[PDB]
Amino acid sequence: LTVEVRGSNGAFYKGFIKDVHEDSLTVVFENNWQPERQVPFNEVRLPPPPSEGDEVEVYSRPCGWWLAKVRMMKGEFYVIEYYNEIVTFERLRPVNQNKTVK
């Protein structure tokens, strides 16, 4: 089961739940950078289900989701802020509204 985990950097890394505990879960990450870990539930959420000025998330770097504002859009391009960077549609999304686990 797929999940997103808050890194110590406040960004969210994709993963899945390999095991459940009384007070932890065991996540493996969908990346070779990070190993299996027991995690507190308040650090874990579900991934989300299926415009300028917007508050969005963005895919960056091990890569994961950071909170960003679209400063300006032109052509294929979005100027975003977190630092500042020019990205394309595929690296962006509205904020994952999901809450962490209870």
Author numbering: 3 to 52, 59 to 69, 75 to 95, 102 to 121
Task: Quote the passages of the study that discuss this structure, keeping the authors' original sentences.
FMRP, Fragile X Mental Retardation Protein, and its autosomal paralogues, FXR1 and FXR2 (Fragile X mental Retardation Syndrome-related Protein 1 and 2, respectively), comprise a family of RNA-binding proteins. The N-terminal region of FMRP, and the FXR1 and FXR2 paralogues, contains a nuclear localization signal between residues 1 and 184. In this work, we present the crystal structures of the NLS of the FXR1 and FXR2 paralogues and definitively classify this region as a member of the Royal Family comprising a tandem Tudor repeat. Extensive structural and biochemical analyses also suggest that this region recognizes tri-methylated protein substrates in a sequence-specific manner common to both paralogues.
The crystal structures of the N-terminal tandem Tudor domains of FXR1 and FXR2 were determined at 2.50 Å and 1.92 Å, respectively, and revealed a conserved architecture as compared with the same region of FMRP. The N-terminal Tudor domain (Tud1) spans residues 2 to 49 of FXR1 and residues 13 to 56 of the FXR2 protein. The Tudor domains tilt toward one another to generate an interdomain angle of approximately 110°. Interaction between Tud1 and Tud2 creates an interface of 257.5 Å2 for FXR1 and 258.9 Å2 for FXR2. The orientation is stabilized in FXR1 by an ionic lock formed by inter-domain salt bridges between E6 and R47 from Tud1 and E65 and R112 from Tud 2. Hydrogen bonds between the mainchain atoms of F14 from Tud1 (F25 in FXR2) and W78 (W89 in FXR2) of Tud2 lend further stability to this region. Finally, the C-terminal extension comprising residues V114 to K122 (or V125 to A131 in FXR2), which fold back along the base of the tandem Tudor domains toward the N-terminus, engages in extensive interactions with the intervening segment that tethers the individual Tudor domains. This results in the formation of several hydrogen bonds that assist in anchoring of the relative orientations of the domains. The residues defining this pocket (Y95, W97, V66, and E104 for FXR1) are strictly conserved amongst the Fragile X paralogues.
